[PDB]
Design a protein around this motif. Structure first.
Motif, PDB file in Angstrom:
ATOM      1  N   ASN A 248       0.771  -1.314   0.060  1.00  0.00           N
ATOM      2  CA  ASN A 248       0.114   0.092   0.081  1.00  0.00           C
ATOM      3  C   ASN A 248       0.852   1.177   0.059  1.00  0.00           C
ATOM      4  O   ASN A 248       2.007   1.288  -0.505  1.00  0.00           O
ATOM      5  CB  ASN A 248      -1.165   0.182   1.029  1.00  0.00           C
ATOM      6  CG  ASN A 248      -0.413  -0.253   2.567  1.00  0.00           C
ATOM      7  OD1 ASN A 248       0.735   0.098   2.773  1.00  0.00           O
ATOM      8  ND2 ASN A 248      -1.243  -0.598   3.427  1.00  0.00           N
ATOM      9  N   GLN A 249       0.343   2.478   0.378  1.00  0.00           N
ATOM     10  CA  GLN A 249       0.944   3.609   0.085  1.00  0.00           C
ATOM     11  C   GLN A 249       1.835   3.789   1.116  1.00  0.00           C
ATOM     12  O   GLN A 249       3.082   4.421   0.851  1.00  0.00           O
ATOM     13  CB  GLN A 249      -0.287   4.764   0.591  1.00  0.00           C
ATOM     14  CG  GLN A 249       0.116   5.992   0.069  1.00  0.00           C
ATOM     15  CD  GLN A 249       0.940   6.162  -1.272  1.00  0.00           C
ATOM     16  OE1 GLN A 249       1.882   6.314  -1.489  1.00  0.00           O
ATOM     17  NE2 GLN A 249      -0.103   5.856  -2.380  1.00  0.00           N
ATOM     18  N   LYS A 250       1.922   3.182   2.434  1.00  0.00           N
ATOM     19  CA  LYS A 250       3.514   3.112   3.110  1.00  0.00           C
ATOM     20  C   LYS A 250       3.523   1.705   3.439  1.00  0.00           C
ATOM     21  O   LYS A 250       3.489   1.003   4.235  1.00  0.00           O
ATOM     22  CB  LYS A 250       3.220   3.962   4.496  1.00  0.00           C
ATOM     23  CG  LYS A 250       2.412   5.348   4.476  1.00  0.00           C
ATOM     24  CD  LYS A 250       1.832   5.434   5.586  1.00  0.00           C
ATOM     25  CE  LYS A 250       0.382   6.137   5.375  1.00  0.00           C
ATOM     26  NZ  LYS A 250      -0.573   5.226   4.917  1.00  0.00           N
ATOM     27  N   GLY A 251       4.215   0.653   2.253  1.00  0.00           N
ATOM     28  CA  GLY A 251       4.671  -0.490   2.619  1.00  0.00           C
ATOM     29  C   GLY A 251       3.974  -1.680   3.567  1.00  0.00           C
ATOM     30  O   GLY A 251       4.948  -2.260   3.949  1.00  0.00           O
ATOM     31  N   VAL A 252       2.988  -1.709   3.399  1.00  0.00           N
ATOM     32  CA  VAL A 252       2.113  -2.871   4.165  1.00  0.00           C
ATOM     33  C   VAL A 252       1.450  -3.669   2.852  1.00  0.00           C
ATOM     34  O   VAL A 252       0.661  -3.010   2.117  1.00  0.00           O
ATOM     35  CB  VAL A 252       1.037  -2.391   5.211  1.00  0.00           C
ATOM     36  CG1 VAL A 252       0.966  -3.623   6.055  1.00  0.00           C
ATOM     37  CG2 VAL A 252       1.705  -1.416   6.000  1.00  0.00           C
ATOM     38  N   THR A 253       1.496  -5.042   3.161  1.00  0.00           N
ATOM     39  CA  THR A 253       0.871  -5.900   1.931  1.00  0.00           C
ATOM     40  C   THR A 253      -0.397  -5.888   2.086  1.00  0.00           C
ATOM     41  O   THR A 253      -1.069  -6.301   3.473  1.00  0.00           O
ATOM     42  CB  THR A 253       1.503  -7.264   2.313  1.00  0.00           C
ATOM     43  OG1 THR A 253       0.737  -8.055   3.138  1.00  0.00           O
ATOM     44  CG2 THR A 253       3.031  -6.951   2.588  1.00  0.00           C
ATOM     45  N   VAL A 254      -1.505  -5.581   1.251  1.00  0.00           N
ATOM     46  CA  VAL A 254      -2.744  -5.896   1.144  1.00  0.00           C
ATOM     47  C   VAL A 254      -3.049  -6.670  -0.149  1.00  0.00           C
ATOM     48  O   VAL A 254      -2.198  -7.242  -0.667  1.00  0.00           O
ATOM     49  CB  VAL A 254      -3.471  -4.572   0.757  1.00  0.00           C
ATOM     50  CG1 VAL A 254      -2.803  -3.255   1.773  1.00  0.00           C
ATOM     51  CG2 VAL A 254      -3.121  -3.842  -0.472  1.00  0.00           C
ATOM     52  N   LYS A 255      -4.389  -7.109   0.109  1.00  0.00           N
ATOM     53  CA  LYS A 255      -4.946  -8.062  -1.096  1.00  0.00           C
ATOM     54  C   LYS A 255      -6.146  -7.201  -1.748  1.00  0.00           C
ATOM     55  O   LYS A 255      -6.986  -6.890  -1.067  1.00  0.00           O
ATOM     56  CB  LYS A 255      -5.517  -9.249  -0.455  1.00  0.00           C
ATOM     57  CG  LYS A 255      -6.350  -9.944  -1.254  1.00  0.00           C
ATOM     58  CD  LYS A 255      -6.172 -11.340  -1.173  1.00  0.00           C
ATOM     59  CE  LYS A 255      -7.315 -12.398  -1.954  1.00  0.00           C
ATOM     60  NZ  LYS A 255      -8.615 -12.450  -1.159  1.00  0.00           N
ATOM     61  N   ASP A 256      -5.793  -6.953  -3.069  1.00  0.00           N
ATOM     62  CA  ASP A 256      -6.884  -6.478  -3.728  1.00  0.00           C
ATOM     63  C   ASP A 256      -7.612  -7.329  -4.861  1.00  0.00           C
ATOM     64  O   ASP A 256      -7.108  -8.141  -5.480  1.00  0.00           O
ATOM     65  CB  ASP A 256      -6.132  -5.226  -4.765  1.00  0.00           C
ATOM     66  CG  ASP A 256      -6.912  -4.791  -5.969  1.00  0.00           C
ATOM     67  OD1 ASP A 256      -8.273  -4.370  -5.519  1.00  0.00           O
ATOM     68  OD2 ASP A 256      -6.756  -4.752  -7.045  1.00  0.00           O
ATOM     69  N   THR A 257      -8.880  -7.466  -4.636  1.00  0.00           N
ATOM     70  CA  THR A 257      -9.924  -8.415  -5.579  1.00  0.00           C
ATOM     71  C   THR A 257     -10.956  -7.375  -6.026  1.00  0.00           C
ATOM     72  O   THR A 257     -11.442  -6.520  -5.520  1.00  0.00           O
ATOM     73  CB  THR A 257     -10.215  -9.415  -4.563  1.00  0.00           C
ATOM     74  OG1 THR A 257     -11.001  -8.828  -3.542  1.00  0.00           O
ATOM     75  CG2 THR A 257      -9.420 -10.750  -4.257  1.00  0.00           C
ATOM     76  N   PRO A 258     -11.289  -7.979  -7.321  1.00  0.00           N
ATOM     77  CA  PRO A 258     -12.635  -7.463  -8.000  1.00  0.00           C
ATOM     78  C   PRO A 258     -13.815  -8.245  -7.481  1.00  0.00           C
ATOM     79  O   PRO A 258     -13.452  -9.388  -6.864  1.00  0.00           O
ATOM     80  CB  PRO A 258     -12.282  -7.318  -9.522  1.00  0.00           C
ATOM     81  CG  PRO A 258     -11.522  -8.576  -9.765  1.00  0.00           C
ATOM     82  CD  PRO A 258     -10.552  -8.611  -8.328  1.00  0.00           C
ATOM     83  N   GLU A 259     -14.832  -7.748  -7.543  1.00  0.00           N
ATOM     84  CA  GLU A 259     -16.200  -8.613  -7.055  1.00  0.00           C
ATOM     85  C   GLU A 259     -16.354  -9.811  -8.115  1.00  0.00           C
ATOM     86  O   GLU A 259     -16.403  -9.660  -9.260  1.00  0.00           O
ATOM     87  CB  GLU A 259     -17.397  -7.488  -7.105  1.00  0.00           C
ATOM     88  CG  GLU A 259     -17.049  -6.145  -6.760  1.00  0.00           C
ATOM     89  CD  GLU A 259     -16.486  -6.286  -5.343  1.00  0.00           C
ATOM     90  OE1 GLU A 259     -17.216  -6.689  -4.392  1.00  0.00           O
ATOM     91  OE2 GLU A 259     -15.803  -5.421  -4.969  1.00  0.00           O
ATOM     92  N   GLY A 260     -16.725 -10.708  -7.356  1.00  0.00           N
ATOM     93  CA  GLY A 260     -17.020 -11.995  -8.356  1.00  0.00           C
ATOM     94  C   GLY A 260     -15.801 -12.749  -8.800  1.00  0.00           C
ATOM     95  O   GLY A 260     -15.967 -13.165 -10.135  1.00  0.00           O
TER      96      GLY A 260
END
Lengths: 151, 52, 151
Positions: free
Chosen positions: A135-147
Motif C-alpha cells: 500500500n501507500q506506506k509499504g504494508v501488504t494488502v490483497k486487492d480483489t474485484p467483485e466475483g
C-alpha cells in the motif's frame, strides 16, 4: 529470473516466486515444489496473502528485489504481455488469463516485482487481475474485484 | 457358539469364491472395451451393464 | 510412439505401454516408472490376462489403438524388426531375445498394437514369443509356447 513451478500429479497448476528473503507460494494451489533445495523448506500458513518460510540458504539469497510505494500508473511488464495501471492491474484481454498461472511476478522496467497474481479469471470484456500489493506506506494488502474466481 | 461359527465361515467363503467369479467375469472383457458383450454374461452370471 | 520403460536402480528391465483407454505393465519385473504422472496410478495386479488400471485422464490418452478383428498372417512391425505370424509368433533371429525386453508392443502396418511380449528368451534356431492377444471375438487370451522362460 527464478520462479520454480509447483507440480501436483505430474502436471503444473501453479508457480512459486522467490522475493528477497522469503519465498512466496500461493496456498489455493496444492502440490510440491520440484526443487530439492526448496522442498525442505517448512510451510507456514497465513491469510490469503499466502506466506511461506524464508529459510533460503545464504549461498543464493536475494533472488529478486521488491518494489515499494510511489508507483506511477506507468507501463509494467507481464509474462504474457503488459499491464498499465497502479490501483489495480490492467484489464488484460481474453486468452491470457487461463489456469495454472497464479504466482507470476509483475515487474517494472527495472525488474522490481510489484505484485503477485492470484485470481480474476473472467471480468466481462477483459479480465481483471486479483493481486497482492504493497500500500501507500509499504504494508501488504490483497486487492480483489467483485466475483473473481481463483485460479 | 459353534453353530454361528459355521454359518460365519461358510458365509465369508462362499462369497469369497463368488467375488473371484465376479472378478474373472470382467478381466476378459475390460481388457478390450471395443469388443461386443453378450446379454447372458451381462446381467445373469455377472453384474456389469453396457457402458460407453 | 509412446512406451515408457521401467527403472530399477538405474538399469532398464521392463517396458510399460499405453493403449486407448488404459495402461499396461508386465508382472515379471519390479521397479518404478520414471514418469511422475504414470507413477501415482493405482496399478492393480491380476491373473495372466494382465488387467491394469488406466486412471490417467483423457488429454494424453490413446497414443495407439489396439488391433481389431480379421487378423492375417501378414506383415507386423516390431521394435527390433518384423514378424509375420498370427497363430504363433515368428522365428526372429538372435539379438532380440535378451533381457528386459518384456512389454514391448507388437504393431501392425497401420500403427495399431496387436500383441505385448512377455517371454521366450531363446528356443534354438527358431525363437518363439509368449504374448497376449485377442483370440477370435476380442476376448483377451495369453499364448505361451513350450519352455518359455520369463523374458
Amino acid at each position: 529470473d527464478k520462479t520454480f513451478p509447483i507440480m501436483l500429479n505430474g502436471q503444473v497448476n501453479g508457480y512459486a516466486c522467490v522475493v528477497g528473503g522469503r519465498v512466496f507460494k500461493p496456498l489455493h494451489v496444492e502440490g510440491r515444489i520440484d526443487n530439492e533445495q526448496l522442498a525442505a523448506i517448512k510451510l507456514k500458513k497465513a491469510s490469503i496473502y499466502d506466506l511461506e518460510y524464508g529459510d533460503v540458504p545464504q549461498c543464493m539469497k536475494s533472488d529478486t528485489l521488491q518494489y515499494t510505494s510511489d508507483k506511477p500508473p506507468g507501463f509494467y511488464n507481464w509474462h504474457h504481455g503488459a499491464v498499465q495501471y497502479e490501483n489495480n492491474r490492467f484489464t488484460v484481454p481474453r486468452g491470457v488469463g487461463g489456469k495454472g498461472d497464479s504466482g507470476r511476478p509483475i515487474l517494472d522496467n527495472k525488474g522490481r516485482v510489484v505484485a503477485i497474481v492470484l485470481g480474476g479469471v473472467n471480468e466481462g470484456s477483459r479480465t481483471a487481475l486479483s493481486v497482492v500489493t504493497w500500500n501507500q506506506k509499504g504494508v501488504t494488502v490483497k486487492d480483489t474485484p467483485e466475483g473473481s474466481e481463483p485460479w | 457358539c459353534t453353530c454361528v461359527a459355521i454359518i460365519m465361515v461358510s458365509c465369508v467363503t462362499s462369497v469369497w469364491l463368488l467375488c473371484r467369479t465376479r472378478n474373472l467375469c470382467i478381466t476378459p472383457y475390460k481388457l478390450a472395451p471395443n469388443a461386443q458383450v453378450p446379454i447372458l454374461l451381462a446381467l445373469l452370471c455377472c453384474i456389469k451393464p453396457t457402458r460407453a
